[PDB]
């Protein structure tokens, strides 16, 4: 909230996963083989150090999660009240990451501007999207996606 502790801010929150947890509706093993291997690029994260390179990768991941769960479809699929708590948490992390950047902490200055890594995360979400479209946004399709993002996002965190 003022980047005064940068180690905090380059991690993903625990509250995020917690909210995603509560959002569940149908079971997880209810959706049998109605699931893809979405090929998340874990390479892009969790490296113990060099969480300097990471800030923008976590920034776009969250912007992505937000955009995915901000559609008319997401609004249909999930509880109104949890989604509002979810956006607040997501908003917080962006606000926090952006804080560090605006005060010269974790400012990307490399030739690629970490774009290759961004594109990676992006392709990962274009597939998530393509999946929900292909599966006519079924309850299962969504539950797979919810569990997937939760797994995915956990790599960005302390766990």
């Amino acid at each position: 909230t003022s980047c005064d502790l940068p180690q905090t801010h380059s991690l993903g929150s625990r509250r995020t996963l917690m909210l995603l947890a509560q959002m569940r509706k149908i079971s997880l093993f209810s959706c049998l083989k109605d699931r893809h291997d979405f090929g998340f690029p874990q390479e892009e994260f969790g490296n113990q150090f060099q969480k300097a390179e990471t800030i923008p990768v976590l920034h776009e991941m969250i912007q992505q999660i937000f955009n995915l769960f901000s559609t008319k479809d997401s609004s249909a699929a999930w509880d109104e009240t949890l989604l509002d708590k979810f956006y607040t948490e997501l908003y917080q992390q962006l606000n926090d990451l952006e804080a560090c950047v605006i005060q010269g902490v974790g400012v990307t200055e490399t030739p690629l501007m970490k774009e290759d890594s961004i594109l990676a995360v992006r392709k990962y979400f274009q597939r998530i999207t393509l999946y929900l479209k292909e599966k006519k946004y079924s309850p299962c399709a969504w539950e797979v996606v919810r569990a997937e993002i939760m797994r995915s996002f956990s790599l960005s965190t302390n766990l």
Partner: antibody
Amino acid sequence: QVQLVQSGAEVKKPGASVKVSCKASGYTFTSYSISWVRQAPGQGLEWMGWISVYNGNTNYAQKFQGRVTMTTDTSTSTAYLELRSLRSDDTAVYYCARDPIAAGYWGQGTLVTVSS
Amino acid sequence: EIVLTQSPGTLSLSPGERATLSCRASQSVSSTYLAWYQQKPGQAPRLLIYGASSRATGIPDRFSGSGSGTDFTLTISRLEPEDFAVYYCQQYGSSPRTFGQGTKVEIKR
């Protein structure tokens, strides 16, 4: 609904100051930082600076460094912008905008008119 | 300082046509820190697109965004009358946040 509602229009002489204000509602005031974008008549947006509502940290555009102070009041969930030694070309609509950018939250804007 | 130069200054298209706004940074910006706004007379800016592609809530499907390095583009697939407005890009990955000087999209008739 989140909303940022700012103070009324101002008219000042040069060398004076303005303390435009911007009141937040629909969310916890301290949890998100706020910045000020300014727009002279018939011209683009111009980012002035940024304040951690929570911790009171500030960043400023060099243009205004040491002539503007941004502050906040947690009890009244109001962010202020003070602008000192005003010039004719501070004539502009001043906006308060809330982080993060994705949030899309802005205020209606306060018009300050500096002139002799 | 990272100077965003928008182009064209004024785009003149008739409704149904395709807009292509350009934004160009004096140096590279991570696509994650680029946004687009739409402003109409007597109104605050309004976020269209964040992180370079992502549509804000309420922003319709006809709006898309792309770009990386120094070049970025907003595309309005099928211009409605609603849409004729001034459009700004913004970078926000660095010290002074900066905006493009804006493109007026005005109705051609």
